[PDB]
Each structure stands twice: as structure tokens, then as C-alpha cells.
Task: structure prediction
Amino acid sequence: IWGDSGKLIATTA
Result:
């Protein structure tokens, strides 16, 4: 996981 643990969609925010 490159950022969020679950829904991995933290591109701009």
C-alpha cells in the first residue's frame, strides 16, 4: 500500500 490502508486512492488529496 503506497498511502491509504484500505481504499488506495490518495493521488491529489
Summary: The chain is about 0% helix and 0% strand.
